[PDB]
Design a protein around this ligand. Sequence first.
Ligand SMILES: CCCCC/C=C\C/C=C\CCCCCCCC(=O)O[C@H](COC(=O)CCCCCCCCCCCCCCC)COP(=O)([O-])OCC[N+](C)(C)C
Ligand SMILES: CCCCC/C=C\C/C=C\CCCCCCCC(=O)O[C@H](COC(=O)CCCCCCCCCCCCCCC)COP(=O)([O-])OCC[N+](C)(C)C
Ligand SMILES: O=P(O)(O)O[C@@H]1[C@@H](OP(=O)(O)O)[C@H](OP(=O)(O)OP(=O)(O)O)[C@@H](OP(=O)(O)O)[C@H](OP(=O)(O)OP(=O)(O)O)[C@@H]1OP(=O)(O)O
Ligand SMILES: O=P(O)(O)O[C@@H]1[C@@H](OP(=O)(O)O)[C@H](OP(=O)(O)OP(=O)(O)O)[C@@H](OP(=O)(O)O)[C@H](OP(=O)(O)OP(=O)(O)O)[C@@H]1OP(=O)(O)O
Ligand SMILES: O=P(O)(O)O[C@@H]1[C@@H](OP(=O)(O)O)[C@H](OP(=O)(O)OP(=O)(O)O)[C@@H](OP(=O)(O)O)[C@H](OP(=O)(O)OP(=O)(O)O)[C@@H]1OP(=O)(O)O
Ligand SMILES: O=P(O)(O)O[C@@H]1[C@@H](OP(=O)(O)O)[C@H](OP(=O)(O)OP(=O)(O)O)[C@@H](OP(=O)(O)O)[C@H](OP(=O)(O)OP(=O)(O)O)[C@@H]1OP(=O)(O)O
Ligand SMILES: CC(C)CCC[C@@H](C)[C@H]1CC[C@H]2[C@@H]3CC=C4C[C@@H](O)CC[C@]4(C)[C@H]3CC[C@]12C
Ligand SMILES: CC(C)CCC[C@@H](C)[C@H]1CC[C@H]2[C@@H]3CC=C4C[C@@H](O)CC[C@]4(C)[C@H]3CC[C@]12C
Lengths: 578, 574
Amino acid sequence: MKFAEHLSAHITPEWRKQYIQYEAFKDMLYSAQDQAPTVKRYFAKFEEKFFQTCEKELAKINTFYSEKLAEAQRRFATLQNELQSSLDAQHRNIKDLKLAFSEFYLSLILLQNYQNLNFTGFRKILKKHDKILETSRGADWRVAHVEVAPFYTCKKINQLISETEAVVTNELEDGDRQKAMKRLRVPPLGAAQPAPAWTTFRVGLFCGIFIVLNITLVLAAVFKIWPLIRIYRGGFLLIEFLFLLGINTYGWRQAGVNHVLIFELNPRSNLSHQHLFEIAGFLGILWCLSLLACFFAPISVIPTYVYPLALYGFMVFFLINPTKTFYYKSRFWLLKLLFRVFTAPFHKVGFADFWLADQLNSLSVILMDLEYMICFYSLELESGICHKYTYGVRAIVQCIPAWLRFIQCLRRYRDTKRAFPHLVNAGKYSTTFFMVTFAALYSTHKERGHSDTMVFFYLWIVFYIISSCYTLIWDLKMDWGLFDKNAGENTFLREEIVYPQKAYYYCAIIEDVILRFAWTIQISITSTTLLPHSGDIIATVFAPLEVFRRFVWNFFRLENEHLNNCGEFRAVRDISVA
Amino acid sequence: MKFAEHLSAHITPEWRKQYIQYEAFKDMLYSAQDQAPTVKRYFAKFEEKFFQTCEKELAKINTFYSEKLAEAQRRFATLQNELQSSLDAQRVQHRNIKDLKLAFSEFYLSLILLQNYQNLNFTGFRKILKKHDKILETSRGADWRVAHVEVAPFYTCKKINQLISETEAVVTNELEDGDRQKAMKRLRVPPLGAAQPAPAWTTFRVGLFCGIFIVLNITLVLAAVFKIWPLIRIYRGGFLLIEFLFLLGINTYGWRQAGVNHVLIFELNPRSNLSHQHLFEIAGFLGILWCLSLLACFFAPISVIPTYVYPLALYGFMVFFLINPTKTFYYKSRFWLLKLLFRVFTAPFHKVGFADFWLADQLNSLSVILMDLEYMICFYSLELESGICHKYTYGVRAIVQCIPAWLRFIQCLRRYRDTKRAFPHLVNAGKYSTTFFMVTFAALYSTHKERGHSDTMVFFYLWIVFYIISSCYTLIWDLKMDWGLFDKNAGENTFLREEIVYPQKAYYYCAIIEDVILRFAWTIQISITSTTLLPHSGDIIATVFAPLEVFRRFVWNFFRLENEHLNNCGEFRA
Ligand SMILES: CCCCC/C=C\C/C=C\CCCCCCCC(=O)O[C@H](COC(=O)CCCCCCCCCCCCCCC)COP(=O)([O-])OCC[N+](C)(C)C
Ligand SMILES: CCCCC/C=C\C/C=C\CCCCCCCC(=O)O[C@H](COC(=O)CCCCCCCCCCCCCCC)COP(=O)([O-])OCC[N+](C)(C)C
Ligand SMILES: O=P(O)(O)O[C@@H]1[C@@H](OP(=O)(O)O)[C@H](OP(=O)(O)OP(=O)(O)O)[C@@H](OP(=O)(O)O)[C@H](OP(=O)(O)OP(=O)(O)O)[C@@H]1OP(=O)(O)O
Ligand SMILES: O=P(O)(O)O[C@@H]1[C@@H](OP(=O)(O)O)[C@H](OP(=O)(O)OP(=O)(O)O)[C@@H](OP(=O)(O)O)[C@H](OP(=O)(O)OP(=O)(O)O)[C@@H]1OP(=O)(O)O
Ligand SMILES: O=P(O)(O)O[C@@H]1[C@@H](OP(=O)(O)O)[C@H](OP(=O)(O)OP(=O)(O)O)[C@@H](OP(=O)(O)O)[C@H](OP(=O)(O)OP(=O)(O)O)[C@@H]1OP(=O)(O)O
Ligand SMILES: O=P(O)(O)O[C@@H]1[C@@H](OP(=O)(O)O)[C@H](OP(=O)(O)OP(=O)(O)O)[C@@H](OP(=O)(O)O)[C@H](OP(=O)(O)OP(=O)(O)O)[C@@H]1OP(=O)(O)O
Ligand SMILES: CC(C)CCC[C@@H](C)[C@H]1CC[C@H]2[C@@H]3CC=C4C[C@@H](O)CC[C@]4(C)[C@H]3CC[C@]12C
Ligand SMILES: CC(C)CCC[C@@H](C)[C@H]1CC[C@H]2[C@@H]3CC=C4C[C@@H](O)CC[C@]4(C)[C@H]3CC[C@]12C
């Protein structure tokens, strides 16, 4: 029943081009039926063409299966040699060995699913051809060729799988088959894994509560001592980022972008997009409750300043919660990633590290708000001293994410030794640093006229232009891999696009072009006191736009990275054991 | 992976005892492995016992499959004969061909169910034998599977397959003018039971509506605590409707979890049946609208818009949500609800089925809605003495209260006329007529309480005696003729029937106690609402009791459906 959708949902993305072209065969059959009027010879010629195409596709599948089987055999030999060496040596090495064996087992299961799905598609398409042509020649062809093809008659995959299970359960699990077959089981993968009903119900309940509380907050603020906007902007931006990240995960899963492999996550257990949605909904519920408490102040004895403190403390505890509950695995992974990012020079820069550093760079408003709150607590508790003046530490705090990204680029240059990409990327962060420094200098000289304020203004404008152009060019050319000379039909894009619509690509181009300038203006204003009157409003309005731009950029960067992965037909992590 | 859960979910409840008892073999194997200590002799004895049990189960499956194959062949022959007769016969013909199409679809579904039975039994046998081989570290379970399971009549008979093929051919050739696609659009059998999870969007919408409803209720309580028309008497009807929909969604979920084939009992379509999730969604949306209307009444932000429009609109929309001609929102279940309502409100002119009686009982548990509609009409007619409609009783009020009881009584009379079985329908008619007697005597007492007739006490005593009579009648029929409890064959289900499908008997005992208490409360509430009686606290007591009546009817739906599935209490099937 509707094998096309099943194949599309179950196809391994990295091997998408190597599967049965079921939709193409359906289109050919329908076109032949429509163009049918001498009729017998026309049908015979169409059948000959169909059989030639089927032979070509079968040869393609056979070749790909042979290459992947050879790769699996080589990986098995290497893993066996490494296991023998480790046994001869006889903690972290054993853990890496288990991870590598699990990855190899996943690869074997993926190849087995590839072969099974290809056979099923062959059978289904041949049956459909027989039904359309009212002839049984398709079944005869299937028996003659499809059922005798090497990709089917080759049972090496199953025996290799069994040998892997035996090795894992004997030499790694101490002869226990219960501990084995659990690390390596390969449950349903891709987009064919429905989420729990209770999770969806919780997502909906949280979304509804958040919507009602937002409506109530708007109504109260329109109908009814501490800067609430500055305090709560960070939380609002975090909730919006989590929601858009859930959307990003959903889109990656739908479009086949294997972010699981890109982020080096666990293929067997993953956090679904609805989990992110429910986390965002719960955090938004807490944020709205805190804001409503601040507005109405229900508990008179309890002051108004403790509500945001409790909200943020609960958020921090939830992220840090040592107990093995509330997505403890994902939270620990995120904590490790954050530790690696904030200490970038001392760890190798993987895709996850740079990606999270970019996310933080798009969320610098949270750090700015935290620093402003610290300043307000230290000094205010001259009205508005923190807002009326800017200092060097403010600029350093603003550039901290840019510093992290720049030093990550430097570390990547040191490791890979390739100069062009890493140095150019480190150059964009350098133009970002030069911008904030010049803005801060201009703001400092404005109050204390040093007679060089206009020179600094001109320099800041120039560097603003340079930084905006640098970031936009890097986003559209390198991060998104667009504007490539290899694109024939996809003008202003690359040869292969994973997402269905090119209009989406064009809209993303336009929105990124506008929002890069918007974000540059927002950061320049926030980092200093250029616009002391309305600057807070501009920053508040622009920060959600920055998060939206980061969300689109995540979409397209992950798409480009997934396309690069597809180029090498790499569907599993490369695990090296020390 | 976990075949036990998959089997339990995919078992057809009607044939539940007829499937391989995977759990029994699991427990037997686990106990044998746990009690193992000489050792070879014990292992051989256990193997002999296990294979004897396997052979017994295989023979059971074979006999059941033979019985069902014979039944399928008989049904196919009868349907083919009926189709031949219909073809030779050629408004009445249109209905005949429609009924033949429906019967062919039902027979195809039965064939698909038998095929699924075959496949599931074979899979379970193979998996349990594989587990036995793994536990006993031997290669004998597979040998026995090949020797017996793989050559057994149930697994070696392809008769059912050609039966399905012949059914498809016959349908496509004699009921669709040769169109395969049209025939398959109705013959195709999607997964049944818990096999198909509800749509993700459906669950998300249910949760969204639940959250919106909860927050709106909190806001409504806060507004009422802090902050021309009786809001209680105008909104309790909608509140009761929402509560009834929510509890009916719970009832559907419990029926699906307990293996009660309510689809067959209500004669619904097995290929596409409304689930508890949709009922929860509808209840949540209606609750959102109700809360918004009541918030508007409490606040009345818009001044040009009067307050009285807010209730009306809501109810109006509810009407527009049930009589919507377009095929937009639950059209297939709304039209089936409209036809059932038309049949119930015209009871004496239709063959009373299970759906009609069930909906009439639901209305008997939702008479407060009709009473409040009549009270709103009274308020509009006269009040708009101030409370002239609350301070008096009239025959219209009594007949409005009795309407559901009148419908049930006429349904029972029609059932007696058709089936010709005196006892059940006549006793039910007397049970429903006790309601007429109680209501009319209460109305007379209230009417005479205003003037010194000197007959107030005799009428009060008659009302008390008939109240007791009606309460006892209703309770006894609920506990002995609806739930089928207090049966003589209570070997280990004391105070219950021989066989019970719900997990716990504590549920049954709590249900009995709740049924008694809430039947008394319902009778008292009908007495309060039908007349003046209490002139001050009547409204509050009625409002408090009506949700209890809805809950009691919800538990009654549970147990009535259970007894119907287990026994033909209503005699609605051959
Ligand atoms: C001040 C800076 C604020 C923090 C910075 C902003 C956001 C950080 C959160 C998430 C970004 C990471 C997203 C990864 C992208 C892949 C998609 C995915 O979500 O994939 C997930 C992993 O990722 C996540 O679940 C991310 C965790 C999100 C939890 C939410 C915590 C929020 C805490 C709020 C902070 C409060 C601060 C106070 C405010 C002043 C795959 O799931 P798995 O279970 O296979 O995970 C892997 C686990 N193995 C490897 C063992 C299987
Ligand atoms: C005193 C005033 C009025 C009181 C309230 C009146 C009626 C509501 C009561 C019951 C509703 C039916 C319950 C179904 C029980 C069987 C189990 C099941 O779940 O069966 C459902 C039947 O779904 C229903 O009927 C609809 C459920 C209820 C939806 C509510 C719609 C809006 C109503 C507005 C209220 C109107 C008054 C205005 C307010 C003053 C299975 O659906 P299917 O699609 O298989 O249907 C079969 C369709 N084939 C046979 C063609 C495939
Ligand atoms: O009866 P019909 O005509 O409505 O459906 C037929 C056919 O569709 P057709 O009309 O030719 O275009 C198949 O493709 P389709 O439309 O679903 O696929 P697309 O997604 O559009 O590619 C369908 O599913 P499947 O074979 O692809 O999985 C299959 O159903 P089913 O009994 O489950 O077959 P099995 O899976 O058990 O073999 C039927 O095959 P017949 O035995 O030849 O009648
Ligand atoms: O297999 P590892 O050793 O590489 O990793 C496992 C190891 O901890 P590690 O990470 O190495 O520090 C286990 O403890 P350990 O060293 O005493 O002994 P083992 O050799 O595992 O028997 C721990 O508890 P346990 O589950 O096994 O009882 C388990 O927790 P986890 O499944 O998260 O969660 P829970 O089920 O505990 O709640 C880890 O599984 P993963 O992190 O998913 O790989
Ligand atoms: O845990 P492991 O990995 O060491 O052994 C598991 C394995 O047994 P295996 O060696 O092939 O015989 C599964 O087979 P599988 O899915 O690959 O099947 P196929 O070959 O593809 O058909 C079997 O599932 P299954 O038989 O119900 O389908 C599963 O049964 P379990 O969950 O108990 O569920 P129950 O049936 O008892 O309810 C076993 O779990 P455990 O015995 O609890 O440890
Ligand atoms: O269930 P039933 O068979 O007892 O009654 C069906 C019948 O309605 P009636 O009582 O005569 O007014 C159909 O019209 P009809 O006589 O021309 O003939 P057919 O039964 O089709 O031969 C109608 O299709 P429509 O003409 O409006 O599209 C269809 O509704 P609806 O789902 O919208 O139909 P679809 O979108 O699935 O096609 C009804 O349910 P179902 O067939 O199960 O679907
Ligand atoms: C601001 C103006 C000029 C342009 C706005 C365009 C926005 C709405 C566009 C830019 C990129 C687009 C996204 C690109 C990719 C996907 C993945 C797909 O599986 C679901 C839709 C989704 C998530 C798109 C939604 C619409 C989107 C966010
Ligand atoms: C406080 C007392 C008197 C009230 C009566 C007890 C109530 C709570 C009892 C009566 C009947 C019971 C239901 C009977 C059957 C089922 C189906 C089962 O699959 C889940 C539980 C569920 C849904 C029960 C929930 C509890 C229930 C509603």
